[PDB]
Amino acid sequence: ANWEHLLSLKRQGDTAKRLRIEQDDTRLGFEVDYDAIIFSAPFRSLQDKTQVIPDFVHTRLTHSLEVSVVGRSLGRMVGKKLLEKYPHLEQVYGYKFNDFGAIVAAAALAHDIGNPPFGHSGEKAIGEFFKNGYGKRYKDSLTAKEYQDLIKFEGNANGFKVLSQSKPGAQGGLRLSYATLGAFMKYPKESLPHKPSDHIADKKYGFFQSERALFEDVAQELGLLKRDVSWSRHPLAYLVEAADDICYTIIDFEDGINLGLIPEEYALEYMVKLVGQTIDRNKYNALQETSDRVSYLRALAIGTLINESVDTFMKYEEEILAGTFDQSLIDKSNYQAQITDIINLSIERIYNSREVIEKEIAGYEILSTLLEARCRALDNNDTHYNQLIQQLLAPSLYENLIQICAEVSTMTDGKALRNYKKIKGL
Amino acid sequence: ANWEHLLSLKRQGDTAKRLRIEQDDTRLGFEVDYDAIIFSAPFRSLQDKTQVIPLSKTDFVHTRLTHSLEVSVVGRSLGRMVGKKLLEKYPHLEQVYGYKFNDFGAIVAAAALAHDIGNPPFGHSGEKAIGEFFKNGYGKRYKDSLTAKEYQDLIKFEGNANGFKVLSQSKPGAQGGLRLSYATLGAFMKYPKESLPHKPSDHIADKKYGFFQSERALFEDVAQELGLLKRSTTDDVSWSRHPLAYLVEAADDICYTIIDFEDGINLGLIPEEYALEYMVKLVGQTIDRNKYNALQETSDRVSYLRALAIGTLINESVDTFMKYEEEILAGTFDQSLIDKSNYQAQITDIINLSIERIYNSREVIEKEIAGYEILSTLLEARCRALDNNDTHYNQLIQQLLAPSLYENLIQICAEVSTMTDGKALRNYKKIKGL
Ligand SMILES: [Mn+2]
Numbered sequence: 001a002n003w004e005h006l007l008s009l010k011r012q013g014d015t016a017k018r019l020r021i022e023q024d025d026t027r028l029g030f031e032v033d034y035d036a037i038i039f040s041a042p043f044r045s046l047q048d049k050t051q052v053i054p055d056f057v058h059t060r061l062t063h064s065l066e067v068s069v070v071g072r073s074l075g076r077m078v079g080k081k082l083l084e085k086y087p088h089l090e091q092v093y094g095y096k097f098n099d100f101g102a103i104v105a106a107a108a109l110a111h112d113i114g115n116p117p118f119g120h121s122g123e124k125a126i127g128e129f130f131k132n133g134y135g136k137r138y139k140d141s142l143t144a145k146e147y148q149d150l151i152k153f154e155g156n157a158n159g160f161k162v163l164s165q166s167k168p169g170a171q172g173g174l175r176l177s178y179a180t181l182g183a184f185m186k187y188p189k190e191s192l193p194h195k196p197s198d199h200i201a202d203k204k205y206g207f208f209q210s211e212r213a214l215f216e217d218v219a220q221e222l223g224l225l226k227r228d229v230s231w232s233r234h235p236l237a238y239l240v241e242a243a244d245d246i247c248y249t250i251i252d253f254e255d256g257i258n259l260g261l262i263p264e265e266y267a268l269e270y271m272v273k274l275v276g277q278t279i280d281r282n283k284y285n286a287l288q289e290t291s292d293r294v295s296y297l298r299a300l301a302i303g304t305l306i307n308e309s310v311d312t313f314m315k316y317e318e319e320i321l322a323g324t325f326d327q328s329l330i331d332k333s334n335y336q337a338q339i340t341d342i343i344n345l346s347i348e349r350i351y352n353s354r355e356v357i358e359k360e361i362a363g364y365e366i367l368s369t370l371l372e373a374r375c376r377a378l379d380n381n382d383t384h385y386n387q388l389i390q391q392l393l394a395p396s397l398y399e400n401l402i403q404i405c406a407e408v409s410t411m412t413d414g415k416a417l418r419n420y421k422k423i424k425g426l
Numbered sequence: 427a428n429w430e431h432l433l434s435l436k437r438q439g440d441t442a443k444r445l446r447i448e449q450d451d452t453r454l455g456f457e458v459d460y461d462a463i464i465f466s467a468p469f470r471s472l473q474d475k476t477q478v479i480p481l482s483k484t485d486f487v488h489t490r491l492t493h494s495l496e497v498s499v500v501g502r503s504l505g506r507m508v509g510k511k512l513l514e515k516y517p518h519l520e521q522v523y524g525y526k527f528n529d530f531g532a533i534v535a536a537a538a539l540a541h542d543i544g545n546p547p548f549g550h551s552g553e554k555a556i557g558e559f560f561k562n563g564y565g566k567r568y569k570d571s572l573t574a575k576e577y578q579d580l581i582k583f584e585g586n587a588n589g590f591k592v593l594s595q596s597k598p599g600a601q602g603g604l605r606l607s608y609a610t611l612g613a614f615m616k617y618p619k620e621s622l623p624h625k626p627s628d629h630i631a632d633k634k635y636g637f638f639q640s641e642r643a644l645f646e647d648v649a650q651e652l653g654l655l656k657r658s659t660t661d662d663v664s665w666s667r668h669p670l671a672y673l674v675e676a677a678d679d680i681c682y683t684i685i686d687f688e689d690g691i692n693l694g695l696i697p698e699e700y701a702l703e704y705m706v707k708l709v710g711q712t713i714d715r716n717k718y719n720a721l722q723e724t725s726d727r728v729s730y731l732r733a734l735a736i737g738t739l740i741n742e743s744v745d746t747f748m749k750y751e752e753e754i755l756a757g758t759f760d761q762s763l764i765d766k767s768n769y770q771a772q773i774t775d776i777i778n779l780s781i782e783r784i785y786n787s788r789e790v791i792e793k794e795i796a797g798y799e800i801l802s803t804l805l806e807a808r809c810r811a812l813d814n815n816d817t818h819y820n821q822l823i824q825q826l827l828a829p830s831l832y833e834n835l836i837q838i839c840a841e842v843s844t845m846t847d848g849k850a851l852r853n854y855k856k857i858k859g860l
């Protein structure tokens with residue numbers, strides 16, 4: 001793989017090559033990508049979507065904003081070192097270290113843009129609707145991969161659809177740079193085969209059958225290595241994933257302490273190695289509020305993990321470029337012991353808290369209900385009832401079903417509740 | 427002081443003495459007292475009243491009823507064990523007069539069952555809402571038409587004193603209220619004094635007062651029959667506590683100390699990580715740690731800890747009572763039984779943890795703030811209606827809430843205090859349009 005091709009400024013439908021040395025740096029293609037996401041309706045809808053808990057708790061937007069800030073640091077630092085490793089990238093082709101930060105930042109900002117309401121239970125509720133719910137009727141009218149798209153409905157693949165979806169008057173969706181689309185794709189494979197290896201890149205899939213032709217174009221332009229289609233990941237996708245990993249590990253922990261779900265004493269206990277070399281003890285002892293102490297620990301822990309993740313990337317750079325790196329960056333951390341205890345305590349005290357369990361069980365019913373109304377109106381567009389269902393909710397069979405799943409996933413948590421209540425009369 | 431008189435079976439209005447030796451043991455006056463409380467409307471209303479944590483439907487929280495049940499079971503056990511040792515010390519009590527050890531358990535059980543029956547809703551904010559209403563609120567108006575003690579009853583309104591009123595209030599067709607035995611009324615009365623003088627000492631019996639001016643004549647009859655020792659020779663009357671009142675108090679101390687902690691752990695207000703650190707001295711010699719470690723639910727681990735600690739404190743309290751029995755009988759004991767505990771420091775640590783994690787939790791603070799407005803509102807509407815009973819709105823307030831000036835104000839306070847948490851909030855909500 002060549003870094004010159006991985007940093008493609010191509011946008012969908014382009015008929016001519018876009019050279020980095022010819023860009024107006026006030027309107028750098030990569031930085032425009034960030035701006036286009038910020039102003040888009042799917043990104044705005046993350047305002048009203050839940051990260052884990054439904055006081056102050058992170059939403060998907062605040063989470064995605066934090067991931068994109070950590071991603072920008074990761075990208076800037078790795079970029080600076082990539083340019084010194086391969087000076088021809090700057091001296092011949094005109095790349096600057098802020099381009100790498102721009103690509104990671106925009107990819108990170110978009111990384112959860114396709115996730116449904118109710119988080120990852122929402123994804124499972126949609127897949128369950130097709131595996132065992134009303135949606136099972138379509139199994140024999142779908143290909144294996146079309147049906148696998150639905151029963152393993154994947155927010156990452158839905159995000160790729162959201163970003164690139166064509167409609168009349170808007171070909172190519174947000175029309176992001178191919179480099180940014182590359183850095184977004186952390187599972188560059190279709191739904192089948194299911195987990196062909198133990199690599200994190202094979203854990204899920206990254207695009208629906210409906211988007212396969214589009215990612216084939218992205219991968220061709222980027223020069224991704226071929227690995228049923230799948231490719232070795234764009235190197236920058238490891239930094240997006242690292243940023244995301246860092247944020248939800250540390251920030252969910254912080255949230256759980258401030259919510260009273262995790263006793264505060266665990267904070268220093270699990271984070272002391274992560275902050276020991278950089279913490280100002282006099283500052284820490286002077287801070288009077290739990291929230292101020294835990295936010296200080298979090299800033300230090302995140303900075304420690306950013307630095308290590310940059311070093312892990314550079315150490316394994318050629319292995320990532322050859323598609324032979326077998327782990328995530330955070331899997332290689334020296335703090336893996338502490339990261340594990342943090343995640344396990346978060347799972348115990350937050351993810352399995354009664355209120356989270358209750359919301360996730362309720363979301364199953366809410367999404368199963370909205371999906372069944374949509375599919376029934378699709379099957380019988382004739383009855384009076386199904387004509388009203390269409391005015392209320394939606395004013396090839398595979399393409400109809402994948403669009404039904406996509407539209408349900410654009411719904412905020414609140415809006416999913418209201419439309420569900422009306423269908424049931426509440 | 428004499429135990430024969432302290433164990434009086436007299437009921438209010440008795441024209442002839444009731445000898446213990448002539449009682450039917452299947453209808454023992456002290457055990458009839460317990461049953462009369464169980465079936466009384468005031469005790470039933472405790473079912474719908476918060477003890478400390480606001481009630482919910484998502485979790486079990488102790489109500490005033492469940493708390494009072496637990497205190498009477500702990501008190502019955504204290505009275506039984508203290509009774510047997512008292513009958514062994516004064517065997518004339520059984521061999522001549524016919525007292526049995528279960529008599530003492532019955533007196534303490536009944537007084538304990540009733541000990542919180544007069545408390546206003548929403549906790550001690552309820553009491554201070556009532557007090558401040560007459561100190562500086564609308565109630566200030568009446569100060570000059572009231573004696574210093576009548577007024578003190580209002581500005582320092584006390585649920586213990588309202589409990590005594592509740593238990594003995596005379597109404598048409600029902601003179602003497604529940605008509606409990608004087609022994610039970612003596613065990614109930616932990617502050618045997620009027621509202622003034624205010625805290626004349628550091629003794630726990632002088633921290634508050636135990637009866638309103640409207641009940642003074644009744645408690646004078648009670649203290650005379652029991653032979654309680656005088657603690658004042660002025661026109662401000664006061665008496666040494668009935669010895670069994672020390673056992674009611676200890677049962678109460680034991681239950682809210684250990685059981686508030688238990689509730690705080692089960693509700694997640696106190697981290698479970700603290701359970702063994704705070705209980706280890708109370709349970710260390712009797713706990714079966716293998717059994718504790720085999721229990722798989724938090725609520726089971728903490729109920730095991732609670733039952734061990736309560737057992738520990740019951741035995742110790744029985745021993746403390748008997749070691750200080752003559753001082754208590756002479757009215758010279760100056761503290762509570764629990765104050766003398768060898769676990770005093772651990773009890774204090776548990777109580778402070780509960781204050782920090784439960785009483786200062788947001789929900790308990792929110793409730794006390796809400797209570798202050800709900801009760802102040804109800805008191806304002808009752809008292810305005812009392813002053814101008816002619817207006818149409820005040821006739822409605824009378825129909826909604828209540829279908830001598832002091833006797834009216836003390837009755838309004840008693841009626842507001844015996845409202846359940848829900849009825850008070852509903853009436854508040856309607857007075858304010860919701
Ligand atoms: Mn994320």
Ligand SMILES: [Mn+2]
Binds near residue numbers: 493497541542
């Ligand atoms: Mn009590």
